[PDB]
Each structure stands twice: as C-alpha cells, then as structure tokens.
Ligand binder design. Structure first.
Ligand SMILES: COc1ccc(CCC(=O)O)cc1
Length: 139
C-alpha cells in the first residue's frame, strides 16, 4: 500500500472536549429521553475522538454517562445504539463542510450537524422545533 491523500474531513480529526452546552435538556425531552437519563446525560462532558481511515470515519465519545463509538462511510446507512439507548438507523453525509447525521427510529427523526467554527467543533442537535448547541474545544 501507499500513503493515501488527505481529505476535507481532516478538519474534524482529532481529540475534542465538550466546553459548553445550551438547551440540551429540552432537546433530549423532545427526543423522548426519560427523566433520570436526561439528568445523568446532561452532566456529561465527553471527549470525542474523530479519526479517518480511508473511507471510514470513526466518532468515539468517551463519557462518564456512556461511551459510544460509530464507524461509517459517508452516504451509507448503518445501525447505531445511541447513548440514551435508542436503536436508530443513521446516515451521515458531508454537505459543504458540515457533517449531517440523521437518525431514524419509531417513525421519528433527529439531525445532528457537526461543523468547524474557528478552533471549535460545534454540534447542533435538532428535533423538530428544538435545537441544542454543544461546543467542543481541542483537548
Ligand atoms: C443523550 O446522550 C447524547 C445524545 C446526543 C448527543 C449528540 C451531541 C454530542 O455528541 O455532544 C450526545 C449525547
């Protein structure tokens, strides 16, 4: 093998730590997360590790609430067990410079967008009319 080329998704690669969150409780309520799970999930300050190997992107969340890991190819649906224990069908695409992650379950949908802004990685979680913004910094 040879050394492969970079990609635009390289802007997301690295080790990230959650530094702020807004409206996450309301997001989780809109998603249907129960009280005890919401309270514990809302305290977490995960690290998030993003890596790329060929076509495969891996997003690992290391958390005091729940450790999750997804590996995927852009545009190709996969099964995901979310930190709050939903079993969802997920598709992640790159639209411009934004990773757009759609999760489908039980006739419901939620979208998680991930975008670089200055030195941060901003995550916006959307369920119907409810948005949560989560900001990560380099660890
Ligand atoms: C409730 O557990 C969750 C659900 C959604 C997320 C997406 C936002 C993020 O990764 O910071 C994280 C933890």
């Amino acid at each position: 093998q040879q050394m492969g080329r970079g990609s635009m998704c390289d802007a997301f690669v690295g080790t990230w730590k959650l530094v702020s969150s807004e409206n996450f409780d309301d997001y989780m309520k809109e998603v249907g997360v129960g009280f005890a799970t919401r309270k514990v999930a809302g305290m977490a300050k995960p690290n998030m590790i993003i890596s790329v190997n060929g076509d495969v992107i891996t997003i690992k969340s290391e958390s005091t609430f729940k450790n999750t890991e997804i590996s995927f190819i852009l545009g190709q649906e996969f099964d995901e067990v979310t930190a709050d224990d939903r079993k969802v069908k997920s598709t992640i695409t790159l639209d411009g410079g934004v990773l757009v992650h759609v999760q489908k379950w039980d006739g419901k949908s939620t979208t998680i967008k991930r975008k670089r802004e200055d030195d941060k990685l901003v995550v916006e979680c959307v369920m119907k009319g409810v948005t949560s913004t989560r900001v990560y910094e380099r660890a």
